[PDB]
Amino acid sequence: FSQAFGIQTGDAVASTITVFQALSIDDQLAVLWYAYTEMGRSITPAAEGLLNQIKQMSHAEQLQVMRDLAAKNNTQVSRSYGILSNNTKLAFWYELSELMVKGFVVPVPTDYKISRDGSQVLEALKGLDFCQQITVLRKVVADMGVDPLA
């Protein structure tokens, strides 16, 4: 608006969601578990069966279903995931990050390096305030998979 007496410049939380969702699947997977490994248990209070199905997949099938979630592909796992309340998506991703971190689950390929563009968003996210990171992470993972109900 021409009302630029020095007023707002945007949402930043919205900007990050946008620049996030403009990323490749692997970048998005990468950025997600960096930002979930670090958030730790602070996203939801300090689902459980979808995790088992993934936890017990061959690492390439885990890749398959992670890419499916980020690409909103209408697979069994995207519908099981999409059917979860958005605050369960929070607890799911937390535990997913712990399985990824402990080595039971493999997001991104075995040769993956975050790109300059991926490292860009990751840094924009990291420097948001605590509550803003929670919003960005809640929203970007709530549009993941597919809602059969919706």
PDB file of C-alpha atoms in Angstrom:
ATOM      1  CA  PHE A   1       0.000   0.000   0.000  1.00  0.00           C
ATOM      2  CA  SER A   2       1.163   3.574  -0.721  1.00  0.00           C
ATOM      3  CA  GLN A   3       0.714   3.948   3.071  1.00  0.00           C
ATOM      4  CA  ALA A   4       4.495   3.355   3.445  1.00  0.00           C
ATOM      5  CA  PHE A   5       5.117   5.856   6.294  1.00  0.00           C
ATOM      6  CA  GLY A   6       7.329   2.984   7.515  1.00  0.00           C
ATOM      7  CA  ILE A   7       4.603   0.520   8.573  1.00  0.00           C
ATOM      8  CA  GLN A   8       4.662  -3.296   8.198  1.00  0.00           C
ATOM      9  CA  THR A   9       6.868  -5.253   5.762  1.00  0.00           C
ATOM     10  CA  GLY A  10       5.098  -8.631   5.841  1.00  0.00           C
ATOM     11  CA  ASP A  11       4.508 -11.790   7.928  1.00  0.00           C
ATOM     12  CA  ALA A  12       8.036 -13.335   7.925  1.00  0.00           C
ATOM     13  CA  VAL A  13       6.240 -16.458   9.192  1.00  0.00           C
ATOM     14  CA  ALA A  14       4.372 -16.388   5.890  1.00  0.00           C
ATOM     15  CA  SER A  15       7.561 -15.529   3.995  1.00  0.00           C
ATOM     16  CA  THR A  16       9.367 -18.535   5.492  1.00  0.00           C
ATOM     17  CA  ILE A  17       6.478 -20.861   4.708  1.00  0.00           C
ATOM     18  CA  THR A  18       6.605 -19.623   1.132  1.00  0.00           C
ATOM     19  CA  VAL A  19      10.350 -19.950   0.660  1.00  0.00           C
ATOM     20  CA  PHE A  20      10.160 -23.339   2.346  1.00  0.00           C
ATOM     21  CA  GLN A  21       7.452 -24.659   0.027  1.00  0.00           C
ATOM     22  CA  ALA A  22       9.463 -23.452  -2.979  1.00  0.00           C
ATOM     23  CA  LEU A  23      12.175 -25.979  -2.058  1.00  0.00           C
ATOM     24  CA  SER A  24      12.861 -29.391  -3.538  1.00  0.00           C
ATOM     25  CA  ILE A  25      11.482 -32.417  -1.693  1.00  0.00           C
ATOM     26  CA  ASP A  26      14.897 -33.407  -0.267  1.00  0.00           C
ATOM     27  CA  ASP A  27      15.614 -29.861   0.851  1.00  0.00           C
ATOM     28  CA  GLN A  28      12.209 -29.784   2.560  1.00  0.00           C
ATOM     29  CA  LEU A  29      12.855 -33.124   4.234  1.00  0.00           C
ATOM     30  CA  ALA A  30      16.331 -31.963   5.251  1.00  0.00           C
ATOM     31  CA  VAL A  31      15.183 -28.569   6.574  1.00  0.00           C
ATOM     32  CA  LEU A  32      12.388 -30.273   8.462  1.00  0.00           C
ATOM     33  CA  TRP A  33      14.441 -32.596  10.599  1.00  0.00           C
ATOM     34  CA  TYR A  34      17.117 -30.020  11.336  1.00  0.00           C
ATOM     35  CA  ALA A  35      14.304 -27.784  12.647  1.00  0.00           C
ATOM     36  CA  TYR A  36      12.643 -30.677  14.488  1.00  0.00           C
ATOM     37  CA  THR A  37      15.801 -32.174  15.980  1.00  0.00           C
ATOM     38  CA  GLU A  38      16.419 -28.730  17.416  1.00  0.00           C
ATOM     39  CA  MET A  39      12.877 -27.841  18.552  1.00  0.00           C
ATOM     40  CA  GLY A  40      12.899 -31.202  20.255  1.00  0.00           C
ATOM     41  CA  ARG A  41       9.990 -31.546  22.675  1.00  0.00           C
ATOM     42  CA  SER A  42       9.033 -27.866  22.730  1.00  0.00           C
ATOM     43  CA  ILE A  43       6.646 -28.061  19.737  1.00  0.00           C
ATOM     44  CA  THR A  44       3.968 -30.307  21.347  1.00  0.00           C
ATOM     45  CA  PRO A  45       3.625 -31.310  25.074  1.00  0.00           C
ATOM     46  CA  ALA A  46       6.631 -33.383  26.273  1.00  0.00           C
ATOM     47  CA  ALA A  47       0.274 -41.488  15.109  1.00  0.00           C
ATOM     48  CA  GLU A  48       2.202 -43.892  17.273  1.00  0.00           C
ATOM     49  CA  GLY A  49       1.374 -46.694  14.775  1.00  0.00           C
ATOM     50  CA  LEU A  50       2.065 -44.804  11.552  1.00  0.00           C
ATOM     51  CA  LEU A  51       5.494 -44.347  13.077  1.00  0.00           C
ATOM     52  CA  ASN A  52       5.911 -48.075  13.481  1.00  0.00           C
ATOM     53  CA  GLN A  53       5.062 -48.687   9.836  1.00  0.00           C
ATOM     54  CA  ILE A  54       7.711 -46.184   8.758  1.00  0.00           C
ATOM     55  CA  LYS A  55      10.174 -47.255  11.455  1.00  0.00           C
ATOM     56  CA  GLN A  56      10.127 -50.806  10.054  1.00  0.00           C
ATOM     57  CA  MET A  57      10.513 -49.894   6.347  1.00  0.00           C
ATOM     58  CA  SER A  58      13.582 -50.539   4.217  1.00  0.00           C
ATOM     59  CA  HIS A  59      15.511 -47.282   4.083  1.00  0.00           C
ATOM     60  CA  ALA A  60      14.572 -46.728   0.441  1.00  0.00           C
ATOM     61  CA  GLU A  61      10.895 -47.238   1.270  1.00  0.00           C
ATOM     62  CA  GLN A  62      11.283 -44.662   4.044  1.00  0.00           C
ATOM     63  CA  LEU A  63      12.684 -42.287   1.419  1.00  0.00           C
ATOM     64  CA  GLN A  64       9.701 -43.179  -0.741  1.00  0.00           C
ATOM     65  CA  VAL A  65       7.146 -42.260   1.917  1.00  0.00           C
ATOM     66  CA  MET A  66       8.924 -39.153   3.152  1.00  0.00           C
ATOM     67  CA  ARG A  67       9.084 -37.817  -0.408  1.00  0.00           C
ATOM     68  CA  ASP A  68       5.411 -38.797  -0.740  1.00  0.00           C
ATOM     69  CA  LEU A  69       4.434 -36.724   2.313  1.00  0.00           C
ATOM     70  CA  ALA A  70       6.273 -33.628   1.091  1.00  0.00           C
ATOM     71  CA  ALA A  71       4.940 -34.038  -2.442  1.00  0.00           C
ATOM     72  CA  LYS A  72       1.372 -34.503  -1.087  1.00  0.00           C
ATOM     73  CA  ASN A  73       1.173 -37.728  -3.112  1.00  0.00           C
ATOM     74  CA  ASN A  74      -2.042 -39.715  -2.448  1.00  0.00           C
ATOM     75  CA  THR A  75      -0.390 -42.843  -1.001  1.00  0.00           C
ATOM     76  CA  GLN A  76      -1.540 -44.984   1.928  1.00  0.00           C
ATOM     77  CA  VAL A  77       1.026 -43.311   4.231  1.00  0.00           C
ATOM     78  CA  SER A  78       0.060 -39.799   3.125  1.00  0.00           C
ATOM     79  CA  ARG A  79      -3.585 -40.570   3.907  1.00  0.00           C
ATOM     80  CA  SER A  80      -2.796 -42.195   7.238  1.00  0.00           C
ATOM     81  CA  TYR A  81      -0.687 -39.127   8.001  1.00  0.00           C
ATOM     82  CA  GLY A  82      -3.151 -36.627   6.592  1.00  0.00           C
ATOM     83  CA  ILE A  83      -5.934 -38.092   8.742  1.00  0.00           C
ATOM     84  CA  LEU A  84      -4.109 -37.043  11.945  1.00  0.00           C
ATOM     85  CA  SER A  85      -4.998 -33.861  13.818  1.00  0.00           C
ATOM     86  CA  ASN A  86      -2.515 -31.078  13.046  1.00  0.00           C
ATOM     87  CA  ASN A  87      -1.311 -31.179  16.672  1.00  0.00           C
ATOM     88  CA  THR A  88      -0.704 -34.907  16.285  1.00  0.00           C
ATOM     89  CA  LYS A  89       1.315 -34.120  13.172  1.00  0.00           C
ATOM     90  CA  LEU A  90       3.482 -32.175  15.642  1.00  0.00           C
ATOM     91  CA  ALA A  91       4.100 -35.124  17.944  1.00  0.00           C
ATOM     92  CA  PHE A  92       4.532 -37.411  14.931  1.00  0.00           C
ATOM     93  CA  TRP A  93       7.230 -35.226  13.409  1.00  0.00           C
ATOM     94  CA  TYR A  94       8.974 -34.924  16.772  1.00  0.00           C
ATOM     95  CA  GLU A  95       9.261 -38.697  17.131  1.00  0.00           C
ATOM     96  CA  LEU A  96      10.093 -39.002  13.428  1.00  0.00           C
ATOM     97  CA  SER A  97      12.995 -36.641  14.052  1.00  0.00           C
ATOM     98  CA  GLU A  98      14.174 -38.794  16.962  1.00  0.00           C
ATOM     99  CA  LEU A  99      14.049 -41.946  14.809  1.00  0.00           C
ATOM    100  CA  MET A 100      15.891 -40.081  12.078  1.00  0.00           C
ATOM    101  CA  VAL A 101      18.450 -38.848  14.547  1.00  0.00           C
ATOM    102  CA  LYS A 102      18.982 -42.272  16.203  1.00  0.00           C
ATOM    103  CA  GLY A 103      19.345 -43.765  12.710  1.00  0.00           C
ATOM    104  CA  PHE A 104      16.150 -45.827  12.392  1.00  0.00           C
ATOM    105  CA  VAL A 105      14.710 -43.579   9.658  1.00  0.00           C
ATOM    106  CA  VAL A 106      16.382 -41.960   6.667  1.00  0.00           C
ATOM    107  CA  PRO A 107      14.996 -38.679   5.239  1.00  0.00           C
ATOM    108  CA  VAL A 108      16.834 -37.598   1.994  1.00  0.00           C
ATOM    109  CA  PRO A 109      19.370 -39.801   0.054  1.00  0.00           C
ATOM    110  CA  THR A 110      22.684 -41.119   1.263  1.00  0.00           C
ATOM    111  CA  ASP A 111      24.586 -38.492  -0.768  1.00  0.00           C
ATOM    112  CA  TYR A 112      22.451 -35.487   0.178  1.00  0.00           C
ATOM    113  CA  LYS A 113      23.825 -32.024   0.911  1.00  0.00           C
ATOM    114  CA  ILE A 114      21.529 -29.100   1.681  1.00  0.00           C
ATOM    115  CA  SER A 115      21.669 -26.594  -1.145  1.00  0.00           C
ATOM    116  CA  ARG A 116      22.505 -22.904  -0.875  1.00  0.00           C
ATOM    117  CA  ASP A 117      18.756 -22.334  -1.266  1.00  0.00           C
ATOM    118  CA  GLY A 118      18.028 -24.949   1.397  1.00  0.00           C
ATOM    119  CA  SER A 119      20.657 -23.452   3.685  1.00  0.00           C
ATOM    120  CA  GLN A 120      19.023 -20.086   3.029  1.00  0.00           C
ATOM    121  CA  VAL A 121      15.567 -21.079   4.310  1.00  0.00           C
ATOM    122  CA  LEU A 122      17.000 -23.083   7.222  1.00  0.00           C
ATOM    123  CA  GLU A 123      18.751 -19.919   8.411  1.00  0.00           C
ATOM    124  CA  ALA A 124      15.671 -17.719   7.909  1.00  0.00           C
ATOM    125  CA  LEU A 125      13.736 -20.225  10.017  1.00  0.00           C
ATOM    126  CA  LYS A 126      16.445 -20.564  12.695  1.00  0.00           C
ATOM    127  CA  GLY A 127      16.467 -16.780  13.300  1.00  0.00           C
ATOM    128  CA  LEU A 128      12.722 -16.448  13.731  1.00  0.00           C
ATOM    129  CA  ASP A 129      11.550 -16.146  17.312  1.00  0.00           C
ATOM    130  CA  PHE A 130      10.663 -19.317  19.218  1.00  0.00           C
ATOM    131  CA  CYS A 131       6.932 -18.948  18.736  1.00  0.00           C
ATOM    132  CA  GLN A 132       7.353 -18.145  15.026  1.00  0.00           C
ATOM    133  CA  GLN A 133       9.374 -21.304  14.346  1.00  0.00           C
ATOM    134  CA  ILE A 134       6.578 -23.331  15.951  1.00  0.00           C
ATOM    135  CA  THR A 135       4.057 -21.666  13.642  1.00  0.00           C
ATOM    136  CA  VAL A 136       6.198 -22.187  10.538  1.00  0.00           C
ATOM    137  CA  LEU A 137       6.784 -25.824  11.454  1.00  0.00           C
ATOM    138  CA  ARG A 138       3.148 -26.449  12.337  1.00  0.00           C
ATOM    139  CA  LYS A 139       1.851 -25.030   9.074  1.00  0.00           C
ATOM    140  CA  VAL A 140       4.409 -26.519   6.655  1.00  0.00           C
ATOM    141  CA  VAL A 141       3.870 -30.041   8.054  1.00  0.00           C
ATOM    142  CA  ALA A 142       0.090 -29.726   8.269  1.00  0.00           C
ATOM    143  CA  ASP A 143      -0.213 -29.442   4.458  1.00  0.00           C
ATOM    144  CA  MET A 144       1.836 -32.637   4.081  1.00  0.00           C
ATOM    145  CA  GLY A 145       0.349 -35.886   2.867  1.00  0.00           C
ATOM    146  CA  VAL A 146      -3.345 -35.933   1.975  1.00  0.00           C
ATOM    147  CA  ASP A 147      -6.547 -35.552   4.073  1.00  0.00           C
ATOM    148  CA  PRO A 148      -8.950 -38.354   2.948  1.00  0.00           C
ATOM    149  CA  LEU A 149     -11.579 -36.711   5.215  1.00  0.00           C
ATOM    150  CA  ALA A 150     -10.962 -33.435   3.300  1.00  0.00           C
TER     151      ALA A 150
END
